[PDB]
Design an enzyme around this catalytic site. Structure first.
Site, PDB file in Angstrom:
ATOM      1  N   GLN A  10      38.348  52.376  33.733  1.00 28.03           N
ATOM      2  CA  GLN A  10      38.142  52.529  35.170  1.00 28.03           C
ATOM      3  C   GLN A  10      37.680  51.215  35.789  1.00 28.03           C
ATOM      4  O   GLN A  10      38.053  50.883  36.919  1.00 28.03           O
ATOM      5  CB  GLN A  10      37.124  53.645  35.426  1.00 28.03           C
ATOM      6  CG  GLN A  10      36.868  54.017  36.890  1.00 28.03           C
ATOM      7  CD  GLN A  10      38.070  54.646  37.562  1.00 28.03           C
ATOM      8  OE1 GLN A  10      38.866  53.960  38.203  1.00 28.03           O
ATOM      9  NE2 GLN A  10      38.206  55.958  37.420  1.00 28.03           N
ATOM     10  N   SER A 130      34.924  47.056  30.717  1.00 29.31           N
ATOM     11  CA  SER A 130      33.474  47.191  30.736  1.00 29.31           C
ATOM     12  C   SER A 130      33.042  47.902  29.465  1.00 29.31           C
ATOM     13  O   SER A 130      33.528  48.999  29.173  1.00 29.31           O
ATOM     14  CB  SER A 130      33.002  47.973  31.967  1.00 29.31           C
ATOM     15  OG  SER A 130      31.588  48.044  32.012  1.00 29.31           O
ATOM     16  N   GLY A 134      33.833  54.061  26.804  1.00 29.13           N
ATOM     17  CA  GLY A 134      34.487  54.242  25.523  1.00 29.13           C
ATOM     18  C   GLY A 134      35.785  53.468  25.413  1.00 29.13           C
ATOM     19  O   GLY A 134      35.983  52.709  24.459  1.00 29.13           O
ATOM     20  N   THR A 169      24.651  53.384  34.572  1.00 25.50           N
ATOM     21  CA  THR A 169      25.562  54.472  34.901  1.00 25.50           C
ATOM     22  C   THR A 169      25.620  55.533  33.814  1.00 25.50           C
ATOM     23  O   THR A 169      25.779  56.719  34.125  1.00 25.50           O
ATOM     24  CB  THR A 169      26.974  53.918  35.150  1.00 25.50           C
ATOM     25  OG1 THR A 169      27.443  53.249  33.974  1.00 25.50           O
ATOM     26  CG2 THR A 169      26.969  52.945  36.322  1.00 25.50           C
ATOM     27  N   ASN A 196      25.736  45.042  37.446  1.00 25.65           N
ATOM     28  CA  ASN A 196      25.831  46.105  38.439  1.00 25.65           C
ATOM     29  C   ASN A 196      24.896  45.908  39.623  1.00 25.65           C
ATOM     30  O   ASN A 196      25.358  45.851  40.766  1.00 25.65           O
ATOM     31  CB  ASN A 196      25.544  47.460  37.774  1.00 25.65           C
ATOM     32  CG  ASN A 196      26.580  47.828  36.731  1.00 25.65           C
ATOM     33  OD1 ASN A 196      27.565  48.504  37.029  1.00 25.65           O
ATOM     34  ND2 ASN A 196      26.364  47.380  35.501  1.00 25.65           N
ATOM     35  N   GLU A 244      40.491  24.422  29.585  1.00 28.94           N
ATOM     36  CA  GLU A 244      39.247  23.718  29.875  1.00 28.94           C
ATOM     37  C   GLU A 244      38.032  24.615  29.665  1.00 28.94           C
ATOM     38  O   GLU A 244      36.951  24.118  29.329  1.00 28.94           O
ATOM     39  CB  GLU A 244      39.267  23.188  31.311  1.00 28.94           C
ATOM     40  CG  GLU A 244      40.351  22.150  31.601  1.00 28.94           C
ATOM     41  CD  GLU A 244      40.123  20.827  30.891  1.00 28.94           C
ATOM     42  OE1 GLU A 244      39.038  20.635  30.303  1.00 28.94           O
ATOM     43  OE2 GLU A 244      41.036  19.976  30.918  1.00 28.94           O
TER      44      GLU A 244
HETATM   45  N1  LIG Z   1      40.108   6.931  41.604  1.00 30.13           N
HETATM   46  C1  LIG Z   1      40.722   8.277  41.216  1.00 30.13           C
HETATM   47  N2  LIG Z   1      40.143   8.952  40.228  1.00 30.13           N
HETATM   48  C2  LIG Z   1      40.644  10.166  39.833  1.00 30.13           C
HETATM   49  C3  LIG Z   1      41.720  10.678  40.440  1.00 30.13           C
HETATM   50  N3  LIG Z   1      41.996  11.866  39.862  1.00 30.13           N
HETATM   51  C4  LIG Z   1      41.087  12.081  38.897  1.00 30.13           C
HETATM   52  N4  LIG Z   1      40.251  11.037  38.877  1.00 30.13           N
HETATM   53  C5  LIG Z   1      39.060  10.737  38.010  1.00 30.13           C
HETATM   54  O1  LIG Z   1      39.528  10.491  36.536  1.00 30.13           O
HETATM   55  C6  LIG Z   1      38.808  11.591  35.700  1.00 30.13           C
HETATM   56  C7  LIG Z   1      39.692  12.072  34.537  1.00 30.13           C
HETATM   57  O2  LIG Z   1      41.079  11.655  34.762  1.00 30.13           O
HETATM   58  P1  LIG Z   1      42.279  12.794  34.852  1.00 30.13           P
HETATM   59  O3  LIG Z   1      42.197  13.509  36.194  1.00 30.13           O
HETATM   60  O4  LIG Z   1      43.575  12.136  34.737  1.00 30.13           O
HETATM   61  C8  LIG Z   1      42.105  14.017  33.493  1.00 30.13           C
HETATM   62  P2  LIG Z   1      43.710  14.078  32.481  1.00 30.13           P
HETATM   63  O5  LIG Z   1      44.865  14.265  33.399  1.00 30.13           O
HETATM   64  O6  LIG Z   1      43.878  12.796  31.714  1.00 30.13           O
HETATM   65  O7  LIG Z   1      43.632  15.413  31.360  1.00 30.13           O
HETATM   66  P3  LIG Z   1      44.134  16.867  31.705  1.00 30.13           P
HETATM   67  O8  LIG Z   1      44.304  16.996  33.224  1.00 30.13           O
HETATM   68  O9  LIG Z   1      43.140  17.861  31.225  1.00 30.13           O
HETATM   69  O10 LIG Z   1      45.545  17.138  30.979  1.00 30.13           O
HETATM   70  C9  LIG Z   1      38.614  12.520  36.541  1.00 30.13           C
HETATM   71  O11 LIG Z   1      37.492  13.353  36.121  1.00 30.13           O
HETATM   72  C10 LIG Z   1      38.258  11.720  37.961  1.00 30.13           C
HETATM   73  O12 LIG Z   1      36.878  11.232  37.923  1.00 30.13           O
HETATM   74  C11 LIG Z   1      42.314   9.986  41.452  1.00 30.13           C
HETATM   75  O13 LIG Z   1      43.298  10.449  42.015  1.00 30.13           O
HETATM   76  N5  LIG Z   1      41.818   8.797  41.836  1.00 30.13           N
HETATM   77  N1  LIG Z   2      31.556  46.788  39.174  1.00 32.82           N
HETATM   78  C1  LIG Z   2      32.303  47.844  38.868  1.00 32.82           C
HETATM   79  N2  LIG Z   2      32.078  48.528  37.689  1.00 32.82           N
HETATM   80  C2  LIG Z   2      32.833  49.606  37.370  1.00 32.82           C
HETATM   81  C3  LIG Z   2      33.839  50.032  38.222  1.00 32.82           C
HETATM   82  N3  LIG Z   2      34.428  51.113  37.666  1.00 32.82           N
HETATM   83  C4  LIG Z   2      33.823  51.376  36.485  1.00 32.82           C
HETATM   84  N4  LIG Z   2      32.827  50.457  36.294  1.00 32.82           N
HETATM   85  C5  LIG Z   2      31.930  50.374  35.129  1.00 32.82           C
HETATM   86  O1  LIG Z   2      32.396  51.209  34.089  1.00 32.82           O
HETATM   87  C6  LIG Z   2      31.304  51.808  33.423  1.00 32.82           C
HETATM   88  C7  LIG Z   2      31.714  53.141  32.805  1.00 32.82           C
HETATM   89  O2  LIG Z   2      32.567  52.885  31.710  1.00 32.82           O
HETATM   90  P1  LIG Z   2      34.136  53.248  31.750  1.00 32.82           P
HETATM   91  O3  LIG Z   2      34.905  52.478  30.704  1.00 32.82           O
HETATM   92  O4  LIG Z   2      34.658  52.955  33.135  1.00 32.82           O
HETATM   93  O5  LIG Z   2      34.183  54.830  31.452  1.00 32.82           O
HETATM   94  P2  LIG Z   2      35.349  55.777  32.035  1.00 32.82           P
HETATM   95  O6  LIG Z   2      36.436  54.963  32.695  1.00 32.82           O
HETATM   96  O7  LIG Z   2      34.754  56.779  32.992  1.00 32.82           O
HETATM   97  O8  LIG Z   2      35.949  56.534  30.746  1.00 32.82           O
HETATM   98  P3  LIG Z   2      34.986  57.231  29.660  1.00 32.82           P
HETATM   99  O9  LIG Z   2      34.170  56.143  29.004  1.00 32.82           O
HETATM  100  O10 LIG Z   2      35.816  57.926  28.609  1.00 32.82           O
HETATM  101  O11 LIG Z   2      34.053  58.234  30.317  1.00 32.82           O
HETATM  102  C8  LIG Z   2      30.204  51.932  34.463  1.00 32.82           C
HETATM  103  O12 LIG Z   2      28.936  51.692  33.900  1.00 32.82           O
HETATM  104  C9  LIG Z   2      30.541  50.882  35.506  1.00 32.82           C
HETATM  105  O13 LIG Z   2      29.563  49.862  35.530  1.00 32.82           O
HETATM  106  C10 LIG Z   2      34.072  49.350  39.408  1.00 32.82           C
HETATM  107  O14 LIG Z   2      34.964  49.725  40.167  1.00 32.82           O
HETATM  108  N5  LIG Z   2      33.301  48.253  39.730  1.00 32.82           N
END
Ligand SMILES: Nc1nc2c(ncn2[C@@H]2O[C@H](COP(=O)(O)CP(=O)(O)OP(=O)(O)O)[C@@H](O)[C@H]2O)c(=O)[nH]1
Ligand SMILES: Nc1nc2c(ncn2[C@@H]2O[C@H](COP(=O)(O)OP(=O)(O)OP(=O)(O)O)[C@@H](O)[C@H]2O)c(=O)[nH]1
Ligand SMILES: Nc1nc2c(ncn2[C@@H]2O[C@H](COP(=O)(O)CP(=O)(O)OP(=O)(O)O)[C@@H](O)[C@H]2O)c(=O)[nH]1
Ligand SMILES: Nc1nc2c(ncn2[C@@H]2O[C@H](COP(=O)(O)OP(=O)(O)OP(=O)(O)O)[C@@H](O)[C@H]2O)c(=O)[nH]1
Lengths: 427, 426, 426, 427
Positions: A10, A130, A134, A169, A196, A244
């Site tokens: 749910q 969640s 169950g 809950t 929650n 990342e």
């Molecule tokens: N002077 C500039 N610095 C940049 C620019 N873009 C990024 N950076 C700086 O360089 C840092 C790292 O360089 P990159 O953005 O190229 C990360 P890279 O592409 O090598 O690895 P992935 O994207 O994870 O494949 C980055 O954290 C910035 O501080 C830019 O356009 N100009």
């Molecule tokens: N934040 C948020 N939590 C939700 C929501 N719907 C269910 N939950 C969470 O789901 C928990 C209940 O576990 P569920 O896996 O959903 O249980 P169920 O779907 O009624 O099925 P059974 O476990 O068999 O009874 C609750 O404690 C909630 O915190 C929602 O719409 N928003």
């Protein structure tokens, strides 16, 4: 470059229904199934003038599946991809893993295989579930174990909703969370977490929504998970990819628990009165009460921190902002990673849903950061588990499914292993 | 005649490399489509030194864009001058390195390095007589430091006699947009210190520091930072692109700036750097330019030269000017500041001038300096690497690609050695 | 004067043969109806070398289409140039061979081979002086390998002195659209190795490999594959179809390329192969063409020449060009790669040029190579035949037509012999 | 080039009524008998502006024959070609072969002679029947034996509907199938097979027809048998003929049992959401549950495989698809035929019937492949036969017709000879 996702429970499908409506309005995809290289990551090209998402909503209980089939978004999702079970997991880790889990993974596991074969640039996976239930605990560990032994090298971006410290809950959610984390501790590369009452605190103070619902909670969650993958969709000044999140945030393979937060959260009438720049929101995300988890970052030390911005944010004032965070002694970084900052920027701005609670903003930020502050939550979850485990509470249902007392001891000691690792790495 | 093979590695190398072809295309008067629309005949005199002739009087650049992320090439191809490059030169992978030196050097780079060596061999044999290699990369990340430094090793094996020039941007602690910078940094300098003959140490924070004080841009982007560093790439290769009264080739710059085989990490600079609101209140005569060249705050590296002593420096001027005022400025600049210059060399300055200045400017020059203050960057980079390496932090991802922890220690052994080498001559 | 009798056997031979008359008809400027609408007078100088004169200035081609399946002729006759062929030459059976060498060689071919010998005798005696036979077939199937190789044996009996040229496509393990390929393959090379003087080894997977890298067609059909291989058929017979500074007849190509009577299996290639999106970024000068000719990936055979040594190679250029740049390119291409050329021959290259290039291109050439790397194809084809023959799989259908299993063993004896022959000279 | 066909039994004529309505709408032949070289293979030219099929529906029981005469397709088929008997075979191999078979073959055998004399390019024969009955078992072996001694050299494309492992329509179908296969093992060149519950599984999962009938089953069967002969009708890039099915699929003269499958099977509303290319359907036909026979191909090894495509399918992406099947280790090919692939392509696309269950698709594929996986089915059929043969069940009806106990032993040992050949060739 492409990526696929599977939603469980749910909690998953409610976020699934809320996030894919956000993805369709960003790329101008109308809800009837139709409207260049921006939507190819998530949406496919279905012949001519028609698209289909790379989504498979799996759930054992059928109330959520047919509601999506009879919902407003009928033509977007494939009718076959919306998988439905026969019997609910019923809040049991064992029932969704062995009895009902084993008989439904075979339609599911072979589907993601052939659904990936048509793709070519599959970067990884991201799930939504969640562990309080169950099907979110048992079936999720089963499929993630079943695909990790097949692929292995590909990433896995887990998005689990943990229970709050005092709000909850269910009643057996420590048993559900402690058992499924025993399998997730070794196979998952990274796992972002949501709470929650914390997310209720976001919309209470800043967004002044005194009567929110889960529909409103999933919208800002959709802003988070859409903003992290916004670099691969749209062009950016510093493009980042899903790999990342494994290198910059996971210092050790068994300490893989970052936090999650988002800013700026502001209403419509308050957006025009409040100033929008990187300096004020950079202080807002590091504010402790502005997080999506009831946890004090002052108690711990940030192992690593990642930043991802959107909109018209030049690299000058954003670098001056984080430099002020380094000299601010309100928070303390660990000596094992002094340069624990990963900055990112995308040109496409944050969108807004028609009729949504969030307002339109020209810039945004989402911070994912590893920290030793979350050890107390595992101490809290482990502490309350010992109270129920000492009385053998709610145990006869699990052993009635097929398990025994032994793996409960393995689930206890495995979390106990995590606490001694968190206090050792936090030195 | 003395062709230079350009090779753009990494994300930042593609950006500054794309800006490098942009700024020099206006000097040669080349349209973005590829046709000539200049005014001077000397632009065609040495257009073959970087470009290749083709049918219809079209000139394709000798650029080889390499990157492990296909989204980067889409932005470069869709740029202003993106259509002039050759489509065959756009070789690239599909999966990014994710800021990992081991991935882009052993596994992700090894599958593509077989594909790029056949491409650069085409541009090398097609020329009349190759001079060197003008490469752009970043010490951060995995694709720039891992795959970019890999082909430096392979080109050294194939062409050990040619010049290996690198315009490399490097990280710093004040401005750091990546967590894995010191690991990627210390692994890259192990290859640059042994293989390459010359390297320009560009610090990213100084690119921001220079734009506040002198240029005072209120909304600077990465494109503005690429403009000032790409001007230095045009200044180093001005003597062979246009005639001059005292030409200095890239090899002629190497022997004057590289007194020892390991001490070849330079510190670039450029002038005039003046805002539009203060251009009228400045004289273009050379003494106002010379004091800006040797200024402690003008250079694009954060290392303060007053804390050390210059090993050797070069200044390649541009534009029609008087040599007496040029030469005499090199005299008073060094003798008045004898504490900031080594006494075991009588003359640390190297002079050069050209008759064809940039378009829109009548007087200009580029500052090239090899100083012992650069060890401060190697100090802080080494301490950040030793701080994270002493408990084996962020190393388990590197071991997945079959990399050994001893290579990190061997890279650490090279780090303190070159640090102590600069300390010997101070 | 030196007429060439064309004979299109098999399905694929009719397709490439139909494309062969198509591409050369534009060179000679012949309408599909049969009338001349060209511009140059040299087109009529050697129009009789392939065509026959008729009333009304109409030129019928000297093509003999043979096939055991009448549906193939309906597609060729209903093509663009299908109406120019002679209706009498369209001889054909009714029942197909069904991919069986025994059917098209002993029973299904023997009833029709009496009908085709009287047709080719008409075209042979009607000419002034016949030179050879330009045949097209496929080693796969039954009608191409069975009946096509049969009339090679009969023409050898009648015309033992004339040249027997064959443009034969052959199968491969990566791309295989038929189960009975190695049985049909090993039976066909038994006849080609003994009777024919020259043969071009064309691999189907390389036709797909060349269209990805260089031509980069996003939706290639069989007609696109026929275009590039038919250009090679025009390149081999260019010297006698148009004048040139250094003419090389098909017999002049044979003595240079066939050092021994069995080693005559060649490896064709063609250039320029460039897409429309990269035509402007390429120079038509000969050094960019020469590096593409001798490229390991340019040829239409999957055998990598770097794993062996070239026995002898020929390059027939086309278009007005300078001979010094042409001849000197043949010098540096072989001496720099002396490991890939046999030392017991001083000069492996054969040169030829023509003054009349193809229509739409100013510079072009065709690569013709006899290399020892072709044994890799005979290795994998022999292992596929031995793997299926060692338990007599798919042989009972061949025995129905009276074929003996010893002939399969005799074909197997020829296979390892020619394999070991290529291994002798490596 | 022409070909004739004869339909035997309720299974034959139900496929006969379903396949000839498909052949008439392809060539624009209206059902009233009228509308160049495309229809000449199956349909003749009846003077001027009128056609007749080269079909002879033979059946002993007269309910199917006169229903075709009083059906909608009255004017298409010849009134004399619709042969009818006098007394039903009554589910007996002997009764349709000796008593009722001998007195009706004489009108039938001389008809196919003179019906072939007007033709000139008779490539072979193809039959339609089911060995689960009497007329499909006894009379089919009689006519196929009576024409094989006359022609012999011409091909015979058998299309028999075998019984399912657990589902079955009759009770004595092992006796009917085991006796007729004793004569079919030596005279038949090749025989494609169809199953009962397998084809129901196709329309249940993919076509979501929860209440199908035999009328719907015969439509997709008509797509199979029309697509294999589509090369000789319409022009194709790689034309194949009926003699290819003998050379490429029959490694030994007594192992002549290929499988049958078809793809893509997709409904109307699902066709627009699902992407149509060769990559996804190439994986669908090799999927084990997507076959027309309950048999696991993973247990055996494919001796040979043939592929025939339709529509706008270029030879590039189809060759890349099969190359992925070679390196996929989910299935394993036998060492006796490494290059066991026969690819074919036709330009004319798959049609669609007005009101049919299948949707319009721009491409299709049908795979016929020999494998050693079908030995377990013969082991299953032989195993259950021994249970009834040990008690002499249902034997008094066969010997009452004129047979004895001896040829039952010949039928048993002849299938026993086939099993030792299947385990020997599968090494
Ligand atoms: N002077 C500039 N610095 C940049 C620019 N873009 C990024 N950076 C700086 O360089 C840092 C790292 O360089 P990159 O953005 O190229 C990360 P890279 O592409 O090598 O690895 P992935 O994207 O994870 O494949 C980055 O954290 C910035 O501080 C830019 O356009 N100009
Ligand atoms: N934040 C948020 N939590 C939700 C929501 N719907 C269910 N939950 C969470 O789901 C928990 C209940 O576990 P569920 O896996 O959903 O249980 P169920 O779907 O009624 O099925 P059974 O476990 O068999 O009874 C609750 O404690 C909630 O915190 C929602 O719409 N928003
Ligand atoms: N480059 C091309 N290759 C083709 C073409 N048509 C077929 N082929 C290839 O040649 C292979 C066999 O050649 P053919 O199609 O001629 C089979 P053939 O007609 O000789 O025997 P039958 O059709 O059985 O009477 C075939 O499997 C293809 O791989 C074509 O048009 N162009
Ligand atoms: N798939 C399919 N199978 C059919 C169809 N009609 C009959 N059959 C098969 O035919 C078998 C019965 O054998 P038949 O030869 O038809 O028997 P019959 O026609 O009733 O005549 P008798 O054997 O004398 O009773 C059944 O097991 C069916 O599987 C049909 O329309 N579709």
């Amino acid at each position: 470059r492409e990526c696929i996702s599977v939603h469980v429970g749910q909690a998953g499908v409610q976020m699934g229904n809320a996030c894919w409506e956000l993805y369709c309005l960003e790329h101008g995809i109308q809800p009837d199934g139709q409207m260049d290289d921006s939507f190819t990551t998530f949406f496919c090209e279905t012949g001519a003038g028609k698209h289909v998402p790379r989504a498979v909503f799996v759930d054992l209980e059928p109330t959520v599946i047919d509601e999506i089939r009879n919902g407003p978004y009928r033509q977007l999702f494939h009718p076959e991809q919306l998988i439905t079970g026969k019997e609910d997991a019923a809040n049991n880790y064992a029932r969704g893993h062995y009895t009902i889990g084993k008989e439904i993974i075979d339609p599911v596991l072979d589907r993601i295989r052939k659904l990936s074969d048509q793709c070519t640039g599959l970067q990884g996976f991201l799930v939504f579930h969640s562990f309080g239930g169950g099907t979110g605990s048992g079936f999720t560990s089963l499929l993630m174990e079943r695909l990790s032994v097949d692929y292995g090298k590909k990433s896995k971006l887990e998005f689990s909703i943990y229970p709050a410290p005092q709000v909850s809950t269910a009643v057996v959610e420590p048993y559900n969370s402690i058992l499924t984390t025993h399998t997730t501790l070794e196979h998952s590369d990274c796992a972002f977490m949501v709470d929650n009452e914390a997310i209720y605190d976001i919309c209470r103070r800043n967004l002044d929504i005194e009567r929110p619902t889960y529909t409103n909670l999933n919208r800002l969650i959709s802003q988070i998970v859409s903003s992290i993958t916004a670099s691969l969709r749209f062009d950016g000044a510093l493009n980042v990819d899903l790999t990342e999140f494994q290198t910059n945030l996971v210092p050790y393979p068994r300490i893989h628990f970052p936090l999650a937060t988002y800013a700026p959260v502001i209403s419509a009438e308050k957006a025009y009165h409040e100033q929008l720049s990187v300096a004020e929101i950079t202080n807002a995300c590091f504010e402790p009460a502005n997080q999506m988890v009831k946890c004090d970052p002052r108690h711990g030390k940030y192992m690593a921190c990642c930043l991802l911005y959107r909109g018209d944010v030049v690299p000058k004032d954003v670098n001056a902002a984080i430099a002020a965070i380094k000299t601010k002694r309100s928070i303390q970084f660990v000596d094992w990673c002094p340069t624990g900052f990963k900055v990112g920027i995308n040109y496409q701005p944050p969108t807004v849903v028609p009729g949504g609670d969030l307002a339109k903003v020209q810039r945004a930020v989402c911070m994912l950061s590893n920290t030793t502050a979350i050890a107390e939550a595992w101490a809290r979850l482990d502490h309350k588990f010992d109270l129920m485990y000492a009385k053998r509470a709610f145990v006869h249902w699990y052993v009635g499914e097929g398990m025994e007392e032994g793996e409960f001891s393995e689930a206890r000691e495995d979390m106990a292993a995590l606490e001694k690792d968190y206090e050792e790495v936090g030195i | 005649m003395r062709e230079i093979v350009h090779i753009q590695a990494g994300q930042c190398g593609n950006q500054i490399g794309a800006k490098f072809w942009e700024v020099i295309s206006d000097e040669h008067g080349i349209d973005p489509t590829g046709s000539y629309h200049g005014d001077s005949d000397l632009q065609l005199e040495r257009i073959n030194v970087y470009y290749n002739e083709a049918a219809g009087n079209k000139y394709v650049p000798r650029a080889i864009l390499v990157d492990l992320e296909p989204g980067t090439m889409d932005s470069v191809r869709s740029g202003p001058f993106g259509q002039i490059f050759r489509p065959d030169n756009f070789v690239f992978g599909q999966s990014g390195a994710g800021n990992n030196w081991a991935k882009g050097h052993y596994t992700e780079g090894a599958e593509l390095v077989d594909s790029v060596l056949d491409v650069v061999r085409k541009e090398s044999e097609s020329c009349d007589c190759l001079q060197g290699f003008q490469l752009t990369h970043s010490l951060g990340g995995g694709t720039g430091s891992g795959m970019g430094t890999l082909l430096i090793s392979k080109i050294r094996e194939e062409y050990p006699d040619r010049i290996m020039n690198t315009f490399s941007v490097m990280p710093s602690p004040k401005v750091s947009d990546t967590v894995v910078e010191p690991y990627n940094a210390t692994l890259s300098v192990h290859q640059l210190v042994e293989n390459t003959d010359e390297t320009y140490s560009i610090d990213n924070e100084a690119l921001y520091d220079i734009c506040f004080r002198t240029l005072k841009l209120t909304t600077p982007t990465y494109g503005d930072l690429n403009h000032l560093v790409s001007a230095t790439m045009s200044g180093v290769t001005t003597c062979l692109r246009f005639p001059g009264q005292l030409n200095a080739d890239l090899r002629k710059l190497a022997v004057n700036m590289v007194p020892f085989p390991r001490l070849h990490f330079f510190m670039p600079g450029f002038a005039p750097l003046t805002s539009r609101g203060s251009q009228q209140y400045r004289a273009l005569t050379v003494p106002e330019l010379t004091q800006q060249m040797f200024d402690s705050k003008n250079m694009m590296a954060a290392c303060d030269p007053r804390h050390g002593r210059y090993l050797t420096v070069a200044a390649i001027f541009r534009g029609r000017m008087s040599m007496k005022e040029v030469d005499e400025q090199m005299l008073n600049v060094q003798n008045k500041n004898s504490s900031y210059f080594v006494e075991w060399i009588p003359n640390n300055v190297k002079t050069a001038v050209c008759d064809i200045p940039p378009r829109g400017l009548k007087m200009s020059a580029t500052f090239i300096g090899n100083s012992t203050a650069i060890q401060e960057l190697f100090k802080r980079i080494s301490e950040q690497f030793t701080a994270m390496f002493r408990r084996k932090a962020f190393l388990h991802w590197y071991t997945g690609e079959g990399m050994d922890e001893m290579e990190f220690t061997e890279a650490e052994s090279n780090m303190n050695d070159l640090v102590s080498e600069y300390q010997q001559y101070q």
